[PDB]
Design a binder for this molecule. Structure first.
Ligand SMILES: O=C(CN1C(=O)[C@@H]2[C@H]3CC[C@H](C3)[C@@H]2C1=O)NCc1ccc2c(c1)[C@H]1C[C@@H](N2)[C@H](O)CO1
Length: 164
């Protein structure tokens, strides 16, 4: 089966709730495994204690830069970057979970959750899962962003892990 993982997210130290994500290991096993392991922290690094550093309302919420905390960093469980696995899954609507990148074959740990259909990203960003529950929490995160992407409170992944 596919992994279920979770992110517990706070704003300025106040809890927003839990986002539960299905990782599509049946379609993108390498990409799913990277995210899963970064949620559990089992490689010695991962998302716990890192931030949503760019949040654009009516677009997406971006996170995963646990090295630089500014959109320049992050790393994968495999190394500093890994190839685009495939583009089979598309950016079909709110709740799509997809890899940030710096061009072709530059996946690390940064990711985004869509708050709209972002189909102009199809074929360019690897989609590897979706929100199962806690879309309301994603909307709370979205409310602390701005058109520039700069957040108005510090949005932190206080805890994360695997449910199954
Ligand atoms: O944030 C972006 C660009 N970017 C956007 O501007 C749009 C926004 C709307 C949907 C998403 C977010 C989309 C997006 O990806 N690039 C930063 C980045 C991402 C991954 C990696 C790196 C840097 C580092 C480390 C590691 N991985 C590799 O070693 C490469 O260098």
């Amino acid at each position: 089966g596919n992994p279920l993982v979770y992110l517990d997210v706070d704003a300025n130290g106040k809890p927003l709730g839990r986002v539960v994500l299905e990782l599509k290991a049946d379609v993108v096993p390498k990409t799913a495994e990277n995210f899963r392991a970064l949620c559990t922290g089992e490689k010695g690094f991962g998302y716990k204690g890192s931030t949503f550093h760019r949040v654009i309302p009516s677009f997406m919420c971006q996170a995963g830069d646990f090295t630089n905390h500014n959109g320049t960093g992050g790393k994968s469980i495999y190394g500093s970057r890994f190839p685009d696995e495939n583009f089979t899954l598309k950016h079909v609507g709110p709740g799509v979970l997809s890899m940030a990148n710096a061009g072709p074959n530059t996946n690390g740990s940064q990711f985004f959750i869509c708050t709209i259909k972002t189909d102009w990203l199809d074929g360019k960003h690897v989609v590897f899962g979706h929100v199962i529950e806690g879309m309301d929490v994603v909307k709370k995160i979205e409310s602390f962003g701005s058109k520039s992407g700069r957040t108005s409170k510090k949005i932190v992944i206080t805890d994360c892990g695997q449910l199954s």
